[PDB]
């Protein structure tokens, strides 16, 4: 089976890079993120060609990289989508986990 990589992974396809730590996400199944494609959980980098390789941040297709990290109502919960549920009504946690600046994702 695939193993989780080290913490401190930098996602840097964009000018707003974000650090991702697997160890704070163990309660999420691997395949909620590394989701099935053609019936098999896909562990490739998310922006692999043919995957979320569209770097236009307004795109909402299955190729839109920004969309896959930020939007709600997606087939798999996005970073922000899941964090909004986690924070609930707690405004401090909303800032920490979902804020567009000054959050744990974006400075
Ligand atoms: C569950 C224990 C789990 C595994 C296994 C796993 C593996 C994994 C690998 C091998 C990579 C590196 C991919 C590469 O070749 O560079 C990787 C990277 C990311 N992961 Fe992961 N991962 C597991 C769990 C989770 C969970 C639960 C999430 C979502 C909350 C998640 C997300 C990511 C992200 C984002 C990356 C970086 C990918 C990129 O920038 O393209 N993983 N993981
Ligand atoms: C990398 C860890 C990674 C993330 C993160 C990710 C997210 C993601 C979301 C949030 C969706 C739903 C979007 C919606 O509008 O419903 C989604 C959908 C698909 N993805 Fe993805 N995805 C990651 C990785 C990969 C990889 C490595 C590929 C290409 C092999 C890929 C492709 C797709 C496709 C196709 C979809 C649509 C799937 C379907 O509708 O069943 N993703 N992804
Ligand atoms: C998507 C790639 C994604 C990112 C980026 C992300 C980041 C992130 C940070 C920076 C934290 C704070 C802890 C740390 O520094 O590692 C954090 C915490 C939680 N997350 Fe997350 N997260 C991403 C994706 C997801 C997804 C898809 C879910 C749920 C399905 C999820 C959940 C959580 C939870 C729960 C935490 C802990 C909350 C707390 O208050 O610290 N994340 N994430
Ligand atoms: C708040 C809703 C919010 C906004 C707005 C926002 C913006 C943003 C931009 C402009 C980028 C770069 C897009 C581009 O292609 O130029 C970007 C990138 C990432 N973000 Fe973000 N972001 C907002 C909030 C959050 C939060 C709270 C997280 C983490 C849960 C998060 C995550 C990400 C990720 C991952 C990326 C991609 C990093 C990379 O590969 O460079 N965003 N965001």
């Amino acid at each position: 089976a695939p193993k989780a990589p080290a913490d401190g992974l930098k996602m840097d396809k964009t000018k707003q890079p974000v650090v991702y730590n697997h160890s704070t996400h163990k309660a999420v199944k691997c395949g909620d993120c590394h989701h099935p494609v053609n019936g098999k959980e896909d562990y490739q980098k998310c922006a692999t060609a043919g995957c979320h390789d569209n770097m236009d941040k307004k795109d909402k297709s299955a190729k839109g990289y920004y969309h896959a990290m930020h939007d709600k109502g997606t087939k798999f919960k996005s970073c922000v989508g899941c964090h909004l549920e986690t924070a609930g009504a707690d405004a401090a946690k909303k800032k920490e986990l979902t804020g567009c600046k000054g959050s744990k994702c974006h400075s």
Side-chain angles (χ1 to χ4, degrees):
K3 338 79 96 135
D7 281 355
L9 191 163
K10 188 187 277 201
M11 299 176 75
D12 56 15
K13 306 304 300 192
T14 83
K15 293 186 192 180
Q16 308 302 334
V18 175
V19 170
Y20 177 74
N21 301 304
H22 277 82
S23 68
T24 54
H25 295 84
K26 292 182 179 176
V28 180
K29 78 170 205 199
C30 311
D32 279 7
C33 295
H34 306 288
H35 58 77
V37 180
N38 296 308
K40 303 176 196 183
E41 285 174 355
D42 205 293
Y43 291 82
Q44 294 172 280
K45 288 183 176 52
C46 314
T48 295
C51 302
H52 302 282
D53 64 359
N54 185 341
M55 293 293 152
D56 163 4
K57 75 175 161 174
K58 298 184 190 353
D59 182 70
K60 309 292 183 191
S61 81
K63 302 173 347 253
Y65 181 75
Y66 180 97
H67 168 69
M69 309 303 165
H70 295 86
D71 285 347
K72 289 180 59 128
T74 51
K75 185 171 181 174
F76 312 103
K77 291 182 194 295
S78 70
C79 314
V80 177
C82 180
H83 287 196
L84 281 162
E85 295 182 38
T86 302
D90 179 336
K93 284 284 175 188
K94 284 192 198 171
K95 170 66 167 171
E96 192 176 300
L97 296 180
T98 71
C100 308
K101 59 178 198 83
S103 66
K104 297 244 179 210
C105 299
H106 295 302
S107 72

